[PDB]
């Protein structure tokens, strides 16, 4: 495989999203570190498929609303970013308020 | 599109070119198995294999480097040898020269 | 005997006229020479030819070379050619033909009893690569950049502070000598830049009498006329480099008037295309002048459909601007140009940029240098073909060109070029080896000062080291004392006669920087071109002799979604 | 000319009058002070006002500081105060207003060109926490309590040892060189705690000759009167600091002659409500005596609805007890009181109890001493309402007295207090810098010695640090050298003469403790209340003058789900 | 008074009689002795035995040990005794009885206030492993084979280059200086061995006087007659081990001449069997000589249902074979044979085969040398039933017979017996803590030169170390400083006198190699069977005096599947 | 669970599986290091289960196909292997071009 420290980092990423992801799934209101990281792994996804860095930036912001999360969490998160390769290379998606 | 190809034009690569050479007739009298590598001072090979160690004196298999030629117990067969170079100086093996030779 | 080709390459690697395709790019590079006689290659192995008496001779240890990588390709700014390369004594010994000159011909690297090998036959090999422009926001960029084939970073910072963050400054004595001893435990070779914005000398003087090897004008401390001149003033005197960001807002003046106050004088300008930073939109028309060294950071390499989408908020973070105050988003929206991103790919194949670079974590990525690099040199060959200089049915002048960037040229700019930057005898033993098909973007081994310092490896307690996981792990060229003697602490002239790595109690060894002031940009290797360029003030478009100069954003890239897991 | 003021609190952060959450609790701090002059503030960035001729000066190293944090909101014993913090040599300059002389008014804290910056508007800025509990139990426990802002730790262990598991002991010269050498590679400020238990004086003097800043005396060891007054004999004619854990089981005398043992001199009492150990049931009584230093150990607070649950299991465990052991099991249960329990927050509130401690991995939470204390300022508010002193709307005064609990009183208990504890001018620049919505939770930024040793960091190839996944990791300031350089180890008067620290080639900066044997409840920051308390050794119940000191369990506590994944 | 047996085991661990089953094997030990007491053994922790007056005493340091390990179950090859163990100084000073020789009879390890505490009750203790045959491809080796219990790494290597892929050589005095710099960094005492093959005795000289403490000849390097017998001729005159993997291609000869070019100097023969390399098919008959010290790698130990299908790959990548090379397939087969590999493991239990090894990461598993030593004894235990010399209903005598292979005799082969290798007092304190349900799989403490180097450690922030998850982090022994103190590099006796240590700049403590020419198979403590063994050329079946040796496959083993996660 | 390091290092490439092992789900064709996590957390699985190392050689070349990984990657991978505790202890398997 020959992984480098980045995508070592990213594992790391994906799998704070597994533990999220089981939560929600359980009806649970996700805390400040699970939104961060669902809503993350989920953009990292998308530039899998090839979406553009554009309409990564819209998707992301609906991802998670406002009753899907603890209180006060949409304010400890005034935007979300990750990078991950792209079919054009790597590329910085910033997702502002991501939940509403 | 394949990731690092080679795109090796054909054709052959002579080697060794412009040595001396000689064959011999080897024998392996021995109830083991024997194999040479293409640097091995063939006139110090394993006693086993029987064959004229005066002509084979300061030669090496010519065949390309790194490779090996095998003798199963009781085989005969001709090889090609061609001359060492540089100072051709012997030195370990069994240790018959150590010296220039 | 005789021997197919083919049968002959997948032996020993291929051989002069055999063309090998770069990772999964469309360039192609062709075996120009290559140093063997055939017949007498060396191998290592179980009954091979390395081995006592035989490839292998009586010599003692002051006689033979500590390391040979047998059978390697070269790719260098001075060709392309298939050699055995020696290393001794943490340096480059030789290039040519390794062996045992008792029994074999031509043998001009001597191999003995203390000699390990390092089989690179079907391999690649490349001298390390040099990023000048890094900030210090944290210690793990050392390791990043390690893995991706960088073996020196040049830059200054103090860690994740706010100065550091926008800038590559490492400001004064204090932190500067701190910094100094904090690189001991890094595993790349090393050089610190001060914060050149001051137009009292003194306090100059003082930094690099401390230790940096060069001077950052930045404009977030400053970019002014007054400034420029007393960085430049005092680097004339101490032999060491100024890098410039220049002045966005043209508030004191504007491209001309930053060029008036250089006067002719030698100078290193960052991201001369202008979205990391420079006067508004014409500080690309800098790489016209003959004094002026010119570099590109890599975000903008090479321009596809996602680069001006992901560049604003990136600005913003940077640079610590406020999305709310409007003078602080016109500024940043002022440096993101369709027009000079496009017309910077061209600049790089026609020579005019000399430098490729990261800008690590300040608009920039400090893995993707060499990679990016490549990138543009794919894009440039698949949109304008042949270079004017290409002989042959190949791309080795384009490739000579584009390894030049991160290579050599980096190098004569900060002044270190007779310590490292290409595979040449007596220079550091920085080498990196690699696998055709992963050219660029995932090395095979990375070789410190004579020492393996990173490599691929797979299950620590697996029977081989081949068995997965294989991830990279740090070696024993990144660990202690060893480490110290494979690594360079790159000093100021001035530093180094006063006794300061006495002081600081610097572990590793040491290189003075020299010839700063000296080098011009015709000096830059493959890479000298000076064209009459303009930069239209209302359109932004780039024009050399009047000819628009533009190039198409690309969908998809090479070297990207076939390597990485994420 | 005019700016409103929510404006100006985004720009430059809160200023006189204006109030602050911390974290999710019910605690709100107000703005006591503002040092700087409207219009004059110091801002870094693109274009901001830090830059040459500007709100940078001409002077030379020595004339300015090496760093500065722009627009802090201090939240300190002594006040809350917006102001800029200037650092030099690794210390703490000034407290006041940044910028430069030539046409700036009011600076007192110079910008030249050998300052690094520091943004701190709208961030709480904080002297590092000091925990003087450690248990030596393994060594990731300083990255631990660093990344929750500990910077100094005190303790006592030689590794995953029985000893250390119980007790806070690092037996003997030989042990005691090996840690102090061991500590060079910790990020942390380091003193050492020797076995006091014995009654031969010169095995006590030994270990002090060979290192350690103090003495625990602990039950495990035999916590008889006459060890007791063996280690007090040498503390007082050492000058170091005694730490007890006194006799659970009554064995050698009840509380009464513990503290007839003690007689009257300088003692520094561990988990004084008695579950981590202690006199059955009244261990609580000895915050009534002047001479005592009374802490707490982190798992009881604050008293909660699962607190009671988890100590049986926890205090089998560490102590090495047999729960098929009767009376081993007998002993466990009379150490877990609700009533001392609940008692202990208010007591705390009260100033009766006057530092916070964890006593890691050995009934205690090495991350959580912060954290817990601040839950404990909110469960008190929540129940009790304002304190006495408060003045104004806001709980200022409660914010200053909980925040000595883990700063200044644990280094005036120590001898430390003039190297450490709080922000003043000349004490070492141990700083934590925090974002207002996760103070006490997860730092922004954790500088040692003037360099930052830890911080939160993003993707390492990103373009910029902010990308995720962010977590932290070590900076600059705990690399090699520079570490050495920016941390302490602390010994004692004798050792430091001895010659200890040359002897064993100790690399990190020195420092020694003194003032051990002067200390006094009065002398407690904000701290000083000696209540006529009384336990009914039938009832358990604490009375203060004969009320009934108790409180409520909580169910939910700010500064928990909101904030960790696990 | 009186205790029950059964409760007393609970208390104190097993006493004499009791028996205990290693692991999940059909292995079951005996208590031989117990050097206690009855009423008068040492327990610490909260109201036990070893506090002030009571187990522990008044005297100085100097007059005490620094540690003590109570009530552990020995296991080594002299006995398996129940006893207390004592450490001062960071050598093992007795096994005993401990206490306070004030108030309890017999004791020979008196405690003091500068001694530390490690129960060892119902615990198994053993000395330190020690691995001869270390390929240096990566330092992660350490950790790895520390975990394991293996304290000692001998080998040799430069990282993952292609010599040391396939030998276990670090070539020439560059090199060899490197990596003993290095070894400073490594928890695990080191020594090297350079590249022996060579026919001239100057360039091997080189080696020893630089550092080596041995030199390994391999057939990768040339296998000749001339060279062994220069390698020999050094290492007599020397006092350095020769290691030797012998001309598998029978192609300077066979078995008998290599043998006679040996001409009865002592030698130790790596993976005897065959698999690893050596003489086809014959090498092991190495084992019935006088001046052979004979050693097995672990991939063949012992023979099970997948052992020859992961061989033939495993073989090419060692060592750098090309399986499209007829020559290289057919050779790489000549050297797995289920008949040689069936015969080992009986060879084994009868005392034939002295040692075990891993062969790491070249055709060996660095942290499964301990695991299938067992493992080999429990499938012989199944299979031949109790060996000649069992005396009673355990099977004591086979665990000696094993542990020895592990243990004292590398050590004796190497010439470092007087420093590692056995609970012996004067001998390093390299100590592992097995609990009996883990015993060779997972220790409970790695003790290295006194000091625990790494352990299973929970929880970081929980209120005890053992909450989950727990796995192996590095402790204090394994900290800067403190690991230098705590670790021997071994040099010869060569670079000892020529100042090597000082020149290098080396940090830990250094031992030197003595008697590696003087130990001959009689020396092999329970291992010293010379049979009178032969292999048939044509069948390759291993017969002794005529009787065919073999033994069965297992489908299942002990120590595997029910431990590990993968 | 006293987890050891190399336990700890195949826990790293499970995780890089679970990566491969959603987005071959998805429809995606693997790349390159999402292949040999994929085929190697299989042959993992297929030690524990107490497969033969003979038998996984042949099974694990017929994990993915030439259809579902991207151009070139088949070439990229001319052999994978791995090793796991079988029931008779840690063996080597090796899958020579397990992508076909
Ligand atoms: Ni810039
Ligand atoms: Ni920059
Ligand atoms: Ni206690
Ligand atoms: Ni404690
Ligand atoms: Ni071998
Ligand atoms: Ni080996």
Chains 1, 6 share one sequence.
Not at chain 2, 4 to 12: A, D, I, L, M, R
Not at chain 3, 161 to 176: D, E, K, L, Q, S
Not at chain 3, 357 to 377: C, K, N, Y
Not at chain 3, 411 to 440: M, N, R
Request: with cysteine.
């Amino acid at each position: 495989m020959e992984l480098t420290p980045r995508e070592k980092d990213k594992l790391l990423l994906f799998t704070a999203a597994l533990v999220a992801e089981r939560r929600l799934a359980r009806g649970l209101k996700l805390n400040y570190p699970e939104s961060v990281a669902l809503i993350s792994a989920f953009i990292m996804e998308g530039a899998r498929d090839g979406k553009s860095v554009a309409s990564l930036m819209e998707e992301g912001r609906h991802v998670l609303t406002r009753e899907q999360v603890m209180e006060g969490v949409p304010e400890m998160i005034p935007d979300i970013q990750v990078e991950a390769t792209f079919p054009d290379g790597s590329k910085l998606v910033t997702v502002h308020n991501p939940i509403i | 599109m394949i990731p690092g190809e080679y795109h090796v034009k054909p054709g052959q690569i002579a080697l060794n070119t412009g040595r001396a050479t000689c064959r011999v007739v080897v024998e392996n009298h021995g109830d083991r198995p024997i194999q040479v590598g293409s640097h091995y001072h063939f006139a110090e090979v394993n006693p086993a294999l029987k064959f004229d160690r005066q002509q084979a004196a300061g030669y090496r298999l010519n065949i390309p480097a790194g490779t090996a030629v095998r003798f199963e117990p009781g085989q005969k067969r001709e090889v090609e040898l061609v001359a060492f170079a540089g100072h051709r100086a012997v030195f370990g093996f069994r240790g018959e020269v150590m010296g220039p030779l | 005997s005789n021997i197919s080709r083919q049968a002959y390459a997948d032996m020993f690697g291929p051989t002069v006229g055999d063309k090998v395709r770069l990772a999964d790019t469309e360039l192609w590079i062709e075996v120009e020479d290559d140093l063997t006689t055939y017949g007498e290659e060396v191998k290592f192995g179980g009954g091979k030819v390395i081995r006592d008496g035989m490839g292998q001779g009586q010599m003692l240890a002051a006689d033979c070379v500590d390391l040979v990588l047998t059978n390697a390709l070269i790719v260098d700014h001075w060709g392309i050619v298939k050699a055995d390369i020696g290393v001794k004594d943490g340096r480059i010994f030789a290039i040519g033909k390794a062996g045992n000159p008792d029994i074999q011909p031509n043998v001009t690297i001597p191999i003995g009893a203390a000699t390990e090998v390092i089989a690179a036959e079907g391999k690649i090999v490349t001298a390390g690569g040099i990023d000048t422009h890094i900030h210090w926001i944290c210690p793990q960029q050392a390791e990043e950049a390690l893995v991706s084939g960088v073996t020196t970073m040049v830059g200054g910072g103090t860690g994740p502070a706010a100065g550091t963050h926008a800038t590559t400054c490492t400001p004064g004595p204090w932190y500067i000598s701190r910094m100094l001893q904090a690189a001991d435990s890094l595993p790349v070779n090393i050089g610190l830049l001060g914060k050149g914005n001051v137009s009292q000398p003194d306090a100059l003087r003082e930094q690099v009498a401390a230790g940096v090897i060069g001077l950052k004008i930045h404009e977030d401390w400053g970019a002014t006329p007054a400034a420029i001149d007393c960085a430049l003033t005092v680097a004339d005197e101490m032999d060491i480099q100024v890098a410039l960001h220049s002045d966005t807002l043209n508030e004191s003046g504007f491209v001309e008037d930053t060029l008036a106050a250089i006067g002719g004088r030698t100078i290193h300008t960052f991201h001369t295309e202008g979205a990391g930073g420079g006067h508004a939109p014409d500080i690309i028309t800098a790489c016209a002048h003959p004094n002026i060294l010119p570099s590109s950071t890599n975000p903008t390499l090479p321009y596809t459909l996602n680069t001006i989408d992901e560049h604003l908020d990136m600005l913003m973070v940077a640079h610590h601007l406020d999305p709310d105050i409007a003078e602080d988003v016109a500024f940043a929206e002022s440096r993101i140009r369709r027009e000079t991103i496009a017309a910077e790919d061209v600049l790089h194949d026609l020579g005019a940029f000399s430098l490729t670079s990261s800008d690590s974590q300040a608009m920039g990525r400090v893995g993707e240098v060499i990679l990016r690099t490549w990138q543009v040199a794919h894009r440039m060959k698949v949109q304008r073909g042949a270079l004017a200089e290409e002989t042959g049915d190949n791309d080795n002048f384009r490739v000579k060109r584009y390894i030049a960037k991160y290579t050599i040229n980096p190098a004569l700019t900060h002044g270190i070029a007779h310590e490292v930057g290409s595979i040449e005898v007596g220079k550091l033993a920085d080498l990196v080896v690699w696998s055709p098909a992963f050219f660029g973007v995932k090395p095979a081994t990375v070789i410190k000062g004579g020492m393996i310092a990173i490599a691929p490896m797979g299950d620590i307690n697996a029977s081989i080291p081949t068995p997965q996981p294989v991830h990279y792990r740090p070696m024993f060229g990144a660990l202690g004392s060893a480490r110290h003697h494979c690594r360079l602490t790159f000093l100021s002239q001035a530093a180094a006669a006063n006794g300061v790595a006495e002081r600081l109690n610097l572990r590793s060894a040491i290189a003075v920087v020299k010839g700063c002031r000296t080098v011009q940009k015709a000096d830059m290797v493959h890479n000298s071109l000076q064209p009459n360029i303009t930069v239209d003030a209302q359109t932004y478009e780039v024009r050399v002799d009047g000819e628009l100069i533009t190039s198409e954003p690309a969908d998809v890239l090479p070297m990207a979604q076939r390597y990485f897991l994420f």
